[PDB]
Paper text:
So, for this study, we engineered a construct encoding only the ctATC domain (ctATC-WT; aa 1939–2253) fused to a removable N-terminal His6-maltose binding protein (MBP) tag and then introduced the mutations N2045C and R2238C (ctATC2Cys). Using these criteria, we selected residue N2045, in helix α3, and residue R2238, in helix α12. Indeed, similar ctATC2Cys crystals grown with CP showed extra electron density at the active site assigned to the bound substrate and residues S2029 and K2032 from the CP-loop, which was well-defined in this structure. The binding of CP to ctATC2Cys was as already described for ctATC-WT, including a small hinge closure of the protein subunit. The only important difference in the structures of ctATC2Cys that are free or bound to CP was the presence of the mutated Cys residues and the extra electron density between their side chains that demonstrates the formation of three disulfide bridges between subunits in the trimer. Thus, we conclude that the Cys and formation of the disulfide bridges do not alter the protein folding or oligomerization and do not interfere with the binding of CP. The high-resolution crystal structures of ctATC2Cys also indicate that the disulfide bridge does not alter protein folding and neither impedes the binding of CP nor the induced conformational changes. However, we could not grow crystals of ctATC2Cys in complex with PALA (N-phosphonoacetyl-L-aspartate), a transition state analog that induces a large conformational change of the Asp-domain that is required for the reaction. On the other hand, the activity assays with ctATC2Cys showed that the mutations to Cys increased the activity of the enzyme, making it two-fold faster than the ctATC-WT (v = 8.87 ± 1.06 mmoles·h−1·mg−1). Overall, these assays indicated that disulfide bond formation, rather than hampering protein activity, increases the specific activity, most likely by preventing dissociation of the active trimer at the high dilutions used for the assay.
Author numbering:
A (entry chain A), B (entry chain A), C (entry chain A): 1938 to 2253
């Protein structure tokens, strides 16, 4: 059984918290992705597999989510497992219950917990107190490891080899921490990176220095130019929010500058992959949603299979 | 296997969006109802069947619901399928995500979506963008096709043949669109229809003309008279809301006029079936809830089996 | 099959509403607890059992909950059953639907309902109208029978024989109705009870008289003294809320008086069991959470297996 053989191999994910991309190796991720491909084939054949039938996953989201909370629910159920989605707004959180009490409560009922919480330190709280694996679905928006895993998987699935690709990040590269996580995962590969942002929203110096240290920094630009677009293999977009500028007029100019529409794609390659972790506002125009190069819906689908692979490893 | 044979037959529901009663034929509905009866027998025997074990249903309600959202959850699970109920109030809808982005997101995880949304055009959005079947659970309250299906099923189950029945609609026949949908489904049958409403809440002219064209209009009345009641086989009630009248005094008089209580039933037939799509306020009095003719709880139960039949056809 | 044999025996829980501890006998609870132990062994072996595969449980919480709503969901799913958690804040309750209409609605879809509602009389509404078993998860905070069952189970599991134990209740013994329910369950056993509370929050006279009638009242004290602690086998704590005192200064003094921390445990026995139904505020200090005598997390876990035993009896 192809999947049974892969799931039997050693893995850093097994029985592990999944809190940071810094916990995992290139080899860890290659096995994850191999399993994800087999999960997709299994789902195509069977819909709901028989991998985690005796296991129960809690999801615990203190901040809004559609992709991350629903995809983990679907992934668990499509492994044959059971899910318990916790509605924090009507839980005893409303009576003052701390995060560490909530996690120890749910650990009595479930075999693992997916957590999204507004305090960056929630992952330290989880490590200290929670006696079952916790999967970080977002800690004060600092990290989101399974978003990073699925972003990298999307690139590999869409284009094949990483060698020689040029990846262009556009938008808010300061508060867009998915960019930072993906930069870390890219450190193993012979890629080149272009960074397009307002000066104010450039990468933090430590993340820029990671690209320099890996020999990957190709250019930083305030403009999304034809030349930058024409060499782009992956165009990875982030949302720019109004709070990032003192004036609405500057916010609107910046949005106009970075909006991906047909006037943008005309300068891209025929094979350029447009990605966005979502949700989006208007920074990728609706008019390109049926273009072959609009990959941000496929990206979500790749996320399902990546999360199936992850849950099976953590909880097998 | 009786059910397996029925589910193998051709059906307009298979792999279809379910957006309007106008999509489906009398023959479509007869097969649906035959399957619904077998679903009930299966549930009586087994509780949870093995029909949709590898399938996943998302429910996506932007407006309050008890019957429609819970019955679809229960129907799917009682087919052996899996459900993912999406809480819109804590989803990325709260971060601005459009309906079409939400539908394409959930289509990555699920095999069909039940949608209730306040924009009548949500069904056009679904048709344009959603790559899995969408079942309309209410579009700006304009249509609610599975409510219409279960309303018709209820009549057939309670009384048998449609031939010769007199159906009396009472309450708000202008904003009570379930009345309009049921009128459309009744166009095939030799029934007679009585319409009891304030003048202001009469049927729209196009719906009245449907009854005229079918030779079914028996009378329009502002009063729920003994004579109207005495010829009623089905008394189908809708909620009248305070916003429908400029003054509270007129609202209260209208409510008093149309309230179904024991003083009403004394004029009805011993076999009259009292229906209401629910929720109700006070327009059907609590005092008649244990009367044999109070069919609005049985109506909800018939809805479960109708929705089991529907989901099995759409997703088989 | 050990569990199959126990589940086949007669039980007052079978096909019963579970509304009050006064419905059930010592023999009823002993069978429940025997089954709970076997449920734990089953879950350890299999994760998800095959006991209630064809059954569906609705949960219906009008007030916040983490333990009770999640544990019943997990218990049902770990029996192999299906769950439908109803979000009241987005249900037709928001359109005015009464409790009795909501219960009769959900009874069309499910085989039993867990209810938590702010009206003490909700249990009478359920008995009158609901045609499937209802399990009281809290009725205007007056009773919470499965909390009482799991509290008693926790004592037995932690200490073994009830004979000769001294149980010390501390905090708000007037509004802390779990204390009153546990007092009722303790009436069969040769225990002694100490009551530590502000004068204002002493037991109601009828509950005090129950302890007197059973020969169990050892002392009432405003102070949590070394002498009281040194004879305590079970220290059962309740939350004291600010509304219980006219002034904040008195509230803070009372909290300081009754807070369980290391300075408290130094006077307790090495075998003292510290319990709390939860949620807690600060009345049990975080610093003792990893002490062997801190049993309030294990208490929640015992609750899962108790509720598995309960659901299997009610719905087998």
């Amino acid at each position: 059984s192809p999947l049974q053989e892969m799931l039997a191999a050693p893995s850093s994910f097994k029985k592990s918290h999944v809190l940071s991309v810094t916990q995992f190796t290139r080899a860890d991720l290659h096995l994850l992705f191999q399993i994800a491909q087999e999960m997709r084939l299994g789902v195509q054949r069977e819909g709901v597999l028989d991998i985690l039938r005796g296991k129960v996953l809690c999801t615990l989201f203190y901040e809004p989510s559609t992709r991350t909370s629903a995809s983990f629910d679907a992934a668990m159920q499509r492994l044959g497992g059971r899910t318990i989605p916790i509605q924090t707004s009507t839980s005893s959180v409303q009576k003052g219950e701390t995060l560490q009490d909530t996690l120890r409560t749910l650990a009595c009922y479930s075999d693992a917990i997916v957590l999204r919480h507004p305090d960056e330190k929630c992952v330290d709280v989880a490590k200290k107190y929670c006696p079952v694996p916790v999967i970080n679905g977002g800690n004060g928006s600092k990290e989101h490891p399974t978003q990073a895993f699925l972003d990298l998987f999307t690139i590999r699935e869409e284009l094949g080899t990483m060698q020689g690709l040029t990846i262009t990040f556009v938008g808010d590269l300061l508060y867009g921490r998915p960019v930072h996580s993906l930069v870390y995962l890219l450190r193993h590969y012979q890629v080149k990176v272009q960074l397009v942002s307002p000066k104010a929203l450039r990468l933090p110096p430590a993340v820029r220095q990671q690209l320099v240290d890996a020999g990957q920094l190709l250019c930083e630009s305030e403009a999304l130019t034809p030349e930058i677009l024409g060499r782009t293999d992956v165009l990875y977009c982030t949302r720019v929010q109004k709070e990032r500028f003192p004036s609405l007029a500057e916010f609107e100019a910046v949005k106009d500058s970075y909006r991906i529409d047909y006037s943008t794609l005309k300068y891209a390659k025929p094979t350029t992959v447009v990605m966005h972790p979502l949700p989006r506002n208007e920074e990728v125009a609706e008019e390109v949603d049926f273009d072959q190069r609009a990959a941000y819906f496929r990206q979500m689908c790749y996320g399902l299979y990546c999360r199936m692979a992850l849950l099976a490893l953590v909880m097998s």
